[PDB]
Amino acid sequence: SSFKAADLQLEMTQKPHKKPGPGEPLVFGKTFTDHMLMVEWNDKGWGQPRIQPFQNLTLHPASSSLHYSLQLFEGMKAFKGKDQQVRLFRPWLNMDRMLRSAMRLCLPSFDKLELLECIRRLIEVDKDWVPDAAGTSLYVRPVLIGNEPSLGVSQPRRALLFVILCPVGAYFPGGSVTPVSLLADPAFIRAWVGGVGNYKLGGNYGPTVLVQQEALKRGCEQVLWLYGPDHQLTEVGTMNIFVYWTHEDGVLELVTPPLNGVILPGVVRQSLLDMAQTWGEFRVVERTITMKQLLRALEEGRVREVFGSGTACQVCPVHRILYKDRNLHIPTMENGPELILRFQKELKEIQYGIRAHEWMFPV
Amino acid sequence: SSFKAADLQLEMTQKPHKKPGPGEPLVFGKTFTDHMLMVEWNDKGWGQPRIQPFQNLTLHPASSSLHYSLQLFEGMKAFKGKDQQVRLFRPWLNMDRMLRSAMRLCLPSFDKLELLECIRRLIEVDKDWVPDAAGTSLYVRPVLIGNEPSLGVSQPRRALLFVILCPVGAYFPGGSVTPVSLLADPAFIRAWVGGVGNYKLGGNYGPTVLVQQEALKRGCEQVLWLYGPDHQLTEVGTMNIFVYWTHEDGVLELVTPPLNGVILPGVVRQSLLDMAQTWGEFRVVERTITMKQLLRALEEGRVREVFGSGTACQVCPVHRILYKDRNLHIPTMENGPELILRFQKELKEIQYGIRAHEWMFPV
Ligand SMILES: *Cc1c(COP(=O)(O)O)cnc(C)c1O
Ligand SMILES: *Cc1c(COP(=O)(O)O)cnc(C)c1O
Ligand SMILES: NCC1(CC(=O)O)CCCCC1
Ligand SMILES: NCC1(CC(=O)O)CCCCC1
């Protein structure tokens, strides 16, 4: 059924593009690498995978990817250490999530490890594009779209899988943690139980653009997505949320919302849970967090740190939440931020190859 | 600002496709006409509109239309009367809805009447493609997509508006209306209040494919979309729902769910409400309909007709609903279907120019 890496076609570029410098401030995903991966699917099966020069897609105007959002994507980073070795961070989890997303949209199944090997081969070809400066990396963007020339809402009989790469600079200006303010208004819903918010589908993102603009108009940087009558904290923009506090039972704990359907199962999210569990210094749980619980904890001075997690930012500190038109200062930066700095340090040691780990996949 | 229809550039096809013609099977949305409308948008506003030959779209791999579902569409029909005159059905309402969809996804605004004249000119160029057989029409598909070559989840600085046309056959070949069976399972949710289900965005359709396949496996043609703990009937597949019954207060009425956020404001839906209100023979109301209300009405023999409404089907009868592993028989067909046939006949007479009406826009 699946495409094989052993069947890979190679077409090197004879028109190389200008590489960005470590000194020039880069915007997220605007400058791309020399090559891309492309695999075509039809009802008879997958075609042969190919590494070809970066080029535009040729799509039929009726392609189901453009009309009925038969599209999904992934996002992972490749890191270059001082010894020039490029490594991907827990890519197996991204491949797992990509296949789950594909099944939800009735898009073709593929072998997760064959796609991983094809992606490894692609990054190997564009190795010189992976930067080595502090906090920089190569963003990998796999995409699977429906491509049937039909206006009928049905299972695609044609599909296209492609992977593009882009060098990204340091998220924080310089190399120090800067906090974000969040708008928490229950009128905005990102996902729902029985919905598709737990899959990385394009459809979950388009509607967020206007809401993010509303957050900016109200003086906030990101949106704190609330869910249900009890105003459950779900996500911070397009990042998973973590709260480090002394809970109502008097125990020091790190909590993040559980995977009940409205939470996207983040790779960094899973890594922070795994890392903190291994330390065994405090309680680490997956449990629902409500605004009522957070309000009470803040007034009682029990909150230490609140942060967002994702591939783009790793660990993003939160200093303010605007809920029901009331400002809530989150003492994250006044508490170090001890845990965020510890997570940042240990993730960078694993990611840049200072410490050898099972989480890293060598390219 | 907006693009002007007076600036329209026409490039006719050098390679015309063979038309289906007399007695050939037409599958919905699989056969396309010779030309298409294309309008580009960037930083300096809209470009000049163009009618060019039917061809593939050239999109950058990072196009926000494919990653974050910055896409919307419309659907309306052009009808050809026996004397060869082509007319559009209430297109102003589709233009109004398209603009509302554009605003929700932070896509560029345009003038409703300028796009309408551009679509009229496109249908005029491909006028011979509009079939004249009973119940047949030309399906018009306007689309507006984000076309930003960036991986950032933001408002597009580039967009593309295009319109494609499809000659379609009669939904009920021979003229006789045929009913369908619906699967009603609360585990599947189409939209949520605070979401975007009330807009015609690509994102709302992709997730329905898997649900539709499950309905088919269970022996049902469409999905009856239920919402909330009270199991509110919202939509029949991707069509609005109508119930013709004797209400609990003993009064005969035609009811459809209100525009509370989870219902897409259909043009046919509004047309049926307008038509039924003009007659003044029964009560016409927009009120929430629950499964418990329908169950009580069925056993008491108060339900006369249940149907779906939309551009593709016009008025679609329902004879069975599979709910909680039990089959509920809906007496739609044995009741004529009196109201459905009256709606079908009046709409047919208006659409094919047999009866003059302000609802029709001449091409
Ligand atoms: C991508 C994403 C995340 C984080 O996932 P990572 O795998 O850790 O990058 C969290 N929430 C949403 C809504 C996301 O889209
Ligand atoms: C298109 C659509 C309708 C019907 O709208 P019409 O304008 O009458 O064609 C109803 N519900 C959904 C979900 C739709 O997508
Ligand atoms: N929040 C940004 C991401 C996830 C992340 O990497 O943190 C989601 C939207 C698309 C870009 C990536
Ligand atoms: N139900 C089919 C439509 C609406 C309609 O015309 O009934 C929505 C999906 C795309 C095709 C059109």
PDB file of C-alpha atoms in Angstrom, chain A residues 58-292:
ATOM      1  CA  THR A  58      -0.256  22.486  -9.855  1.00  0.00           C
ATOM      2  CA  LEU A  59      -3.791  21.910  -8.529  1.00  0.00           C
ATOM      3  CA  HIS A  60      -7.109  21.355 -10.344  1.00  0.00           C
ATOM      4  CA  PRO A  61      -9.571  24.210  -9.404  1.00  0.00           C
ATOM      5  CA  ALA A  62     -11.979  21.628  -7.974  1.00  0.00           C
ATOM      6  CA  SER A  63      -9.354  19.986  -5.709  1.00  0.00           C
ATOM      7  CA  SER A  64     -11.106  18.919  -2.485  1.00  0.00           C
ATOM      8  CA  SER A  65      -8.206  20.458  -0.511  1.00  0.00           C
ATOM      9  CA  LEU A  66      -9.453  23.940  -1.472  1.00  0.00           C
ATOM     10  CA  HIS A  67     -13.215  23.446  -1.160  1.00  0.00           C
ATOM     11  CA  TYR A  68     -13.799  21.037   1.720  1.00  0.00           C
ATOM     12  CA  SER A  69     -10.535  21.418   3.689  1.00  0.00           C
ATOM     13  CA  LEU A  70      -9.271  17.884   3.109  1.00  0.00           C
ATOM     14  CA  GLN A  71      -5.933  18.978   4.504  1.00  0.00           C
ATOM     15  CA  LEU A  72      -3.694  18.336   7.482  1.00  0.00           C
ATOM     16  CA  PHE A  73      -0.182  19.256   8.514  1.00  0.00           C
ATOM     17  CA  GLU A  74       2.606  18.589  10.975  1.00  0.00           C
ATOM     18  CA  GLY A  75       5.375  20.579  12.562  1.00  0.00           C
ATOM     19  CA  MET A  76       8.704  19.442  13.973  1.00  0.00           C
ATOM     20  CA  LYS A  77      12.204  20.846  14.348  1.00  0.00           C
ATOM     21  CA  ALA A  78      15.635  19.627  13.256  1.00  0.00           C
ATOM     22  CA  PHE A  79      18.540  20.866  15.405  1.00  0.00           C
ATOM     23  CA  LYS A  80      22.222  21.244  14.497  1.00  0.00           C
ATOM     24  CA  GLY A  81      24.799  20.721  17.254  1.00  0.00           C
ATOM     25  CA  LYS A  82      28.338  22.173  17.490  1.00  0.00           C
ATOM     26  CA  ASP A  83      29.767  18.976  15.954  1.00  0.00           C
ATOM     27  CA  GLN A  84      27.607  19.655  12.818  1.00  0.00           C
ATOM     28  CA  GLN A  85      25.226  16.698  13.439  1.00  0.00           C
ATOM     29  CA  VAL A  86      21.550  17.377  12.608  1.00  0.00           C
ATOM     30  CA  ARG A  87      18.902  15.666  14.789  1.00  0.00           C
ATOM     31  CA  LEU A  88      15.067  15.574  14.798  1.00  0.00           C
ATOM     32  CA  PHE A  89      13.148  15.819  18.107  1.00  0.00           C
ATOM     33  CA  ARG A  90      10.838  12.794  18.780  1.00  0.00           C
ATOM     34  CA  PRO A  91       9.645  12.592  15.131  1.00  0.00           C
ATOM     35  CA  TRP A  92       7.835   9.266  15.721  1.00  0.00           C
ATOM     36  CA  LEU A  93       5.161  11.126  17.719  1.00  0.00           C
ATOM     37  CA  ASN A  94       4.610  13.577  14.830  1.00  0.00           C
ATOM     38  CA  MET A  95       4.282  10.639  12.416  1.00  0.00           C
ATOM     39  CA  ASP A  96       1.770   9.026  14.820  1.00  0.00           C
ATOM     40  CA  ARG A  97      -0.268  12.254  14.968  1.00  0.00           C
ATOM     41  CA  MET A  98      -0.106  12.735  11.173  1.00  0.00           C
ATOM     42  CA  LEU A  99      -1.525   9.257  10.506  1.00  0.00           C
ATOM     43  CA  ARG A 100      -4.343   9.816  13.050  1.00  0.00           C
ATOM     44  CA  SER A 101      -5.168  13.116  11.296  1.00  0.00           C
ATOM     45  CA  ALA A 102      -5.182  11.325   7.916  1.00  0.00           C
ATOM     46  CA  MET A 103      -7.646   8.678   9.153  1.00  0.00           C
ATOM     47  CA  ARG A 104     -10.035  11.300  10.528  1.00  0.00           C
ATOM     48  CA  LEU A 105     -10.250  12.991   7.101  1.00  0.00           C
ATOM     49  CA  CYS A 106     -10.452   9.725   5.093  1.00  0.00           C
ATOM     50  CA  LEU A 107      -7.083  10.538   3.533  1.00  0.00           C
ATOM     51  CA  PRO A 108      -4.715   7.641   2.594  1.00  0.00           C
ATOM     52  CA  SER A 109      -2.737   5.640   5.126  1.00  0.00           C
ATOM     53  CA  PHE A 110       1.028   5.434   4.811  1.00  0.00           C
ATOM     54  CA  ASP A 111       3.835   3.718   6.711  1.00  0.00           C
ATOM     55  CA  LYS A 112       5.020   6.179   9.369  1.00  0.00           C
ATOM     56  CA  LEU A 113       8.613   4.961   9.274  1.00  0.00           C
ATOM     57  CA  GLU A 114       8.860   5.141   5.465  1.00  0.00           C
ATOM     58  CA  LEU A 115       7.762   8.805   5.593  1.00  0.00           C
ATOM     59  CA  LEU A 116      10.289   9.429   8.387  1.00  0.00           C
ATOM     60  CA  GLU A 117      13.118   7.973   6.278  1.00  0.00           C
ATOM     61  CA  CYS A 118      11.997  10.085   3.261  1.00  0.00           C
ATOM     62  CA  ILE A 119      12.027  13.193   5.519  1.00  0.00           C
ATOM     63  CA  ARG A 120      15.505  12.236   6.837  1.00  0.00           C
ATOM     64  CA  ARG A 121      16.760  11.976   3.235  1.00  0.00           C
ATOM     65  CA  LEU A 122      15.258  15.395   2.414  1.00  0.00           C
ATOM     66  CA  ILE A 123      16.940  17.135   5.370  1.00  0.00           C
ATOM     67  CA  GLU A 124      20.220  15.349   4.427  1.00  0.00           C
ATOM     68  CA  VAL A 125      20.052  16.934   0.941  1.00  0.00           C
ATOM     69  CA  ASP A 126      19.356  20.384   2.458  1.00  0.00           C
ATOM     70  CA  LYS A 127      21.780  19.960   5.425  1.00  0.00           C
ATOM     71  CA  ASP A 128      23.563  23.291   4.792  1.00  0.00           C
ATOM     72  CA  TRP A 129      20.252  25.119   5.353  1.00  0.00           C
ATOM     73  CA  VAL A 130      20.000  23.974   8.998  1.00  0.00           C
ATOM     74  CA  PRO A 131      21.439  26.843  11.133  1.00  0.00           C
ATOM     75  CA  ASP A 132      23.671  26.303  14.193  1.00  0.00           C
ATOM     76  CA  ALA A 133      23.260  29.598  16.096  1.00  0.00           C
ATOM     77  CA  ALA A 134      21.708  29.803  19.593  1.00  0.00           C
ATOM     78  CA  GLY A 135      17.987  28.981  19.664  1.00  0.00           C
ATOM     79  CA  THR A 136      17.779  28.485  15.884  1.00  0.00           C
ATOM     80  CA  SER A 137      16.617  25.384  13.955  1.00  0.00           C
ATOM     81  CA  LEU A 138      15.046  23.978  10.774  1.00  0.00           C
ATOM     82  CA  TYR A 139      11.243  23.736  10.773  1.00  0.00           C
ATOM     83  CA  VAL A 140       9.881  20.653   8.971  1.00  0.00           C
ATOM     84  CA  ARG A 141       6.369  20.966   7.521  1.00  0.00           C
ATOM     85  CA  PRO A 142       4.735  17.708   6.235  1.00  0.00           C
ATOM     86  CA  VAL A 143       1.314  18.194   4.595  1.00  0.00           C
ATOM     87  CA  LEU A 144      -1.255  15.729   3.251  1.00  0.00           C
ATOM     88  CA  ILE A 145      -4.093  17.045   1.104  1.00  0.00           C
ATOM     89  CA  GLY A 146      -7.066  15.605  -0.779  1.00  0.00           C
ATOM     90  CA  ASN A 147      -6.705  16.229  -4.508  1.00  0.00           C
ATOM     91  CA  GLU A 148      -9.775  14.841  -6.272  1.00  0.00           C
ATOM     92  CA  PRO A 149     -11.158  17.016  -9.148  1.00  0.00           C
ATOM     93  CA  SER A 150     -14.703  16.785  -7.726  1.00  0.00           C
ATOM     94  CA  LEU A 151     -17.189  19.059  -5.965  1.00  0.00           C
ATOM     95  CA  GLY A 152     -18.819  16.107  -4.198  1.00  0.00           C
ATOM     96  CA  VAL A 153     -18.210  15.910  -0.425  1.00  0.00           C
ATOM     97  CA  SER A 154     -16.703  12.416  -0.296  1.00  0.00           C
ATOM     98  CA  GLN A 155     -13.566  10.338   0.339  1.00  0.00           C
ATOM     99  CA  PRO A 156     -10.782  11.586  -2.013  1.00  0.00           C
ATOM    100  CA  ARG A 157      -9.719   9.194  -4.779  1.00  0.00           C
ATOM    101  CA  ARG A 158      -6.562  11.305  -5.266  1.00  0.00           C
ATOM    102  CA  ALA A 159      -4.189  12.838  -2.712  1.00  0.00           C
ATOM    103  CA  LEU A 160      -0.881  14.678  -2.413  1.00  0.00           C
ATOM    104  CA  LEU A 161       1.720  14.445   0.352  1.00  0.00           C
ATOM    105  CA  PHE A 162       4.477  17.061   0.428  1.00  0.00           C
ATOM    106  CA  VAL A 163       7.155  18.234   2.862  1.00  0.00           C
ATOM    107  CA  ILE A 164       8.736  21.704   2.903  1.00  0.00           C
ATOM    108  CA  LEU A 165      11.546  23.020   5.119  1.00  0.00           C
ATOM    109  CA  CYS A 166      12.374  26.478   6.451  1.00  0.00           C
ATOM    110  CA  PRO A 167      15.152  27.872   8.691  1.00  0.00           C
ATOM    111  CA  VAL A 168      13.747  29.661  11.736  1.00  0.00           C
ATOM    112  CA  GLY A 169      15.493  32.085  14.076  1.00  0.00           C
ATOM    113  CA  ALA A 170      15.345  32.398  17.872  1.00  0.00           C
ATOM    114  CA  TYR A 171      11.771  32.935  19.154  1.00  0.00           C
ATOM    115  CA  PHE A 172      12.932  35.284  21.928  1.00  0.00           C
ATOM    116  CA  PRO A 173      14.715  38.553  20.824  1.00  0.00           C
ATOM    117  CA  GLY A 174      18.301  37.853  21.867  1.00  0.00           C
ATOM    118  CA  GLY A 175      18.118  34.843  24.166  1.00  0.00           C
ATOM    119  CA  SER A 176      15.949  35.668  27.200  1.00  0.00           C
ATOM    120  CA  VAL A 177      12.337  34.735  28.078  1.00  0.00           C
ATOM    121  CA  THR A 178       9.646  37.360  27.396  1.00  0.00           C
ATOM    122  CA  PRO A 179       6.073  36.817  28.748  1.00  0.00           C
ATOM    123  CA  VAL A 180       2.700  37.056  26.958  1.00  0.00           C
ATOM    124  CA  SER A 181      -0.735  38.380  27.971  1.00  0.00           C
ATOM    125  CA  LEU A 182      -3.869  36.328  27.184  1.00  0.00           C
ATOM    126  CA  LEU A 183      -7.507  37.163  26.410  1.00  0.00           C
ATOM    127  CA  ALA A 184      -9.946  34.722  28.039  1.00  0.00           C
ATOM    128  CA  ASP A 185     -13.448  35.240  26.655  1.00  0.00           C
ATOM    129  CA  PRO A 186     -15.883  32.229  26.716  1.00  0.00           C
ATOM    130  CA  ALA A 187     -17.566  33.440  23.493  1.00  0.00           C
ATOM    131  CA  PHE A 188     -14.690  31.992  21.426  1.00  0.00           C
ATOM    132  CA  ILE A 189     -14.546  28.185  20.932  1.00  0.00           C
ATOM    133  CA  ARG A 190     -11.536  26.478  19.268  1.00  0.00           C
ATOM    134  CA  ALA A 191     -12.731  22.897  19.563  1.00  0.00           C
ATOM    135  CA  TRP A 192     -15.515  20.777  20.996  1.00  0.00           C
ATOM    136  CA  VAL A 193     -15.939  17.242  22.435  1.00  0.00           C
ATOM    137  CA  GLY A 194     -16.816  14.976  19.514  1.00  0.00           C
ATOM    138  CA  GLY A 195     -15.080  17.432  17.200  1.00  0.00           C
ATOM    139  CA  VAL A 196     -11.660  17.563  15.537  1.00  0.00           C
ATOM    140  CA  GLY A 197      -9.507  19.791  17.772  1.00  0.00           C
ATOM    141  CA  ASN A 198      -7.335  16.839  18.767  1.00  0.00           C
ATOM    142  CA  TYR A 199      -6.042  16.521  15.179  1.00  0.00           C
ATOM    143  CA  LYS A 200      -3.731  18.956  13.354  1.00  0.00           C
ATOM    144  CA  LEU A 201      -6.190  19.789  10.555  1.00  0.00           C
ATOM    145  CA  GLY A 202      -6.095  23.065   8.649  1.00  0.00           C
ATOM    146  CA  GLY A 203      -9.759  23.648   9.498  1.00  0.00           C
ATOM    147  CA  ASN A 204      -9.008  24.244  13.195  1.00  0.00           C
ATOM    148  CA  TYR A 205      -6.748  27.238  12.365  1.00  0.00           C
ATOM    149  CA  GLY A 206      -8.435  29.534   9.833  1.00  0.00           C
ATOM    150  CA  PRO A 207     -11.250  30.573  12.285  1.00  0.00           C
ATOM    151  CA  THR A 208      -8.617  31.565  14.902  1.00  0.00           C
ATOM    152  CA  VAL A 209      -7.219  34.469  12.823  1.00  0.00           C
ATOM    153  CA  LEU A 210     -10.106  36.875  13.620  1.00  0.00           C
ATOM    154  CA  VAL A 211     -10.086  35.842  17.301  1.00  0.00           C
ATOM    155  CA  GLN A 212      -6.331  36.560  17.542  1.00  0.00           C
ATOM    156  CA  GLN A 213      -6.966  40.008  16.012  1.00  0.00           C
ATOM    157  CA  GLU A 214      -9.649  40.573  18.681  1.00  0.00           C
ATOM    158  CA  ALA A 215      -7.071  39.672  21.367  1.00  0.00           C
ATOM    159  CA  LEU A 216      -4.659  42.271  19.920  1.00  0.00           C
ATOM    160  CA  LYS A 217      -7.431  44.910  19.816  1.00  0.00           C
ATOM    161  CA  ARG A 218      -8.097  44.248  23.518  1.00  0.00           C
ATOM    162  CA  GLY A 219      -4.412  44.576  24.444  1.00  0.00           C
ATOM    163  CA  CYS A 220      -3.433  40.905  24.637  1.00  0.00           C
ATOM    164  CA  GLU A 221      -0.828  38.929  22.649  1.00  0.00           C
ATOM    165  CA  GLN A 222      -2.490  35.487  22.538  1.00  0.00           C
ATOM    166  CA  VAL A 223      -5.892  33.857  23.119  1.00  0.00           C
ATOM    167  CA  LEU A 224      -6.562  31.595  26.135  1.00  0.00           C
ATOM    168  CA  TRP A 225      -9.120  29.157  24.724  1.00  0.00           C
ATOM    169  CA  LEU A 226     -11.943  28.419  27.146  1.00  0.00           C
ATOM    170  CA  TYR A 227     -14.327  25.461  26.952  1.00  0.00           C
ATOM    171  CA  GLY A 228     -17.611  24.417  28.550  1.00  0.00           C
ATOM    172  CA  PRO A 229     -19.945  26.047  31.164  1.00  0.00           C
ATOM    173  CA  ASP A 230     -17.194  25.762  33.799  1.00  0.00           C
ATOM    174  CA  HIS A 231     -14.718  27.709  31.591  1.00  0.00           C
ATOM    175  CA  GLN A 232     -11.978  25.074  31.268  1.00  0.00           C
ATOM    176  CA  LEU A 233      -8.521  26.305  30.191  1.00  0.00           C
ATOM    177  CA  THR A 234      -7.595  24.364  27.061  1.00  0.00           C
ATOM    178  CA  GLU A 235      -4.902  25.968  24.884  1.00  0.00           C
ATOM    179  CA  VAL A 236      -2.762  29.164  24.781  1.00  0.00           C
ATOM    180  CA  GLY A 237      -3.115  30.334  21.166  1.00  0.00           C
ATOM    181  CA  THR A 238      -1.844  27.280  19.308  1.00  0.00           C
ATOM    182  CA  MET A 239       0.201  25.926  22.250  1.00  0.00           C
ATOM    183  CA  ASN A 240      -0.653  23.533  25.115  1.00  0.00           C
ATOM    184  CA  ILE A 241      -1.136  25.071  28.580  1.00  0.00           C
ATOM    185  CA  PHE A 242       0.660  24.203  31.832  1.00  0.00           C
ATOM    186  CA  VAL A 243       0.101  25.553  35.342  1.00  0.00           C
ATOM    187  CA  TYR A 244       2.679  25.093  38.119  1.00  0.00           C
ATOM    188  CA  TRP A 245       1.083  25.651  41.523  1.00  0.00           C
ATOM    189  CA  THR A 246       0.332  24.422  45.026  1.00  0.00           C
ATOM    190  CA  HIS A 247      -3.044  22.710  44.474  1.00  0.00           C
ATOM    191  CA  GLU A 248      -6.148  22.900  46.734  1.00  0.00           C
ATOM    192  CA  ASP A 249      -4.934  19.800  48.618  1.00  0.00           C
ATOM    193  CA  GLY A 250      -1.629  21.503  49.516  1.00  0.00           C
ATOM    194  CA  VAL A 251       0.576  19.540  47.099  1.00  0.00           C
ATOM    195  CA  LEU A 252       3.054  21.199  44.703  1.00  0.00           C
ATOM    196  CA  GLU A 253       2.089  20.179  41.168  1.00  0.00           C
ATOM    197  CA  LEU A 254       2.404  20.693  37.441  1.00  0.00           C
ATOM    198  CA  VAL A 255      -0.910  20.240  35.654  1.00  0.00           C
ATOM    199  CA  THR A 256      -1.977  20.262  32.007  1.00  0.00           C
ATOM    200  CA  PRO A 257      -5.472  19.542  30.507  1.00  0.00           C
ATOM    201  CA  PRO A 258      -6.153  15.869  29.580  1.00  0.00           C
ATOM    202  CA  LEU A 259      -6.622  14.391  26.104  1.00  0.00           C
ATOM    203  CA  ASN A 260     -10.433  14.270  26.100  1.00  0.00           C
ATOM    204  CA  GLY A 261     -10.869  15.552  22.535  1.00  0.00           C
ATOM    205  CA  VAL A 262     -10.432  19.353  22.718  1.00  0.00           C
ATOM    206  CA  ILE A 263      -6.662  19.254  23.280  1.00  0.00           C
ATOM    207  CA  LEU A 264      -4.112  18.742  20.519  1.00  0.00           C
ATOM    208  CA  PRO A 265      -1.637  16.110  21.865  1.00  0.00           C
ATOM    209  CA  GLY A 266       1.559  18.151  21.638  1.00  0.00           C
ATOM    210  CA  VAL A 267       5.005  16.547  21.327  1.00  0.00           C
ATOM    211  CA  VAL A 268       6.563  19.200  23.615  1.00  0.00           C
ATOM    212  CA  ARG A 269       3.565  18.727  25.975  1.00  0.00           C
ATOM    213  CA  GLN A 270       4.270  14.983  26.242  1.00  0.00           C
ATOM    214  CA  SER A 271       8.003  15.678  26.694  1.00  0.00           C
ATOM    215  CA  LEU A 272       7.486  18.127  29.599  1.00  0.00           C
ATOM    216  CA  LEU A 273       5.191  15.614  31.310  1.00  0.00           C
ATOM    217  CA  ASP A 274       7.748  12.797  30.783  1.00  0.00           C
ATOM    218  CA  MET A 275      10.695  14.957  31.938  1.00  0.00           C
ATOM    219  CA  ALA A 276       8.964  16.253  35.083  1.00  0.00           C
ATOM    220  CA  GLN A 277       7.724  12.725  35.930  1.00  0.00           C
ATOM    221  CA  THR A 278      11.294  11.340  35.692  1.00  0.00           C
ATOM    222  CA  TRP A 279      12.587  13.992  38.159  1.00  0.00           C
ATOM    223  CA  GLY A 280      10.024  12.867  40.764  1.00  0.00           C
ATOM    224  CA  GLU A 281      10.290  16.155  42.673  1.00  0.00           C
ATOM    225  CA  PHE A 282       6.604  17.162  42.511  1.00  0.00           C
ATOM    226  CA  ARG A 283       3.215  15.820  41.354  1.00  0.00           C
ATOM    227  CA  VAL A 284       2.742  15.766  37.544  1.00  0.00           C
ATOM    228  CA  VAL A 285      -0.839  15.278  36.314  1.00  0.00           C
ATOM    229  CA  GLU A 286      -3.186  15.540  33.347  1.00  0.00           C
ATOM    230  CA  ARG A 287      -6.398  17.109  34.737  1.00  0.00           C
ATOM    231  CA  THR A 288      -9.004  19.731  33.778  1.00  0.00           C
ATOM    232  CA  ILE A 289      -8.166  23.283  34.932  1.00  0.00           C
ATOM    233  CA  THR A 290     -11.059  25.739  35.399  1.00  0.00           C
ATOM    234  CA  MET A 291     -10.984  29.537  35.640  1.00  0.00           C
ATOM    235  CA  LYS A 292     -12.685  29.248  39.060  1.00  0.00           C
TER     236      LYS A 292
END
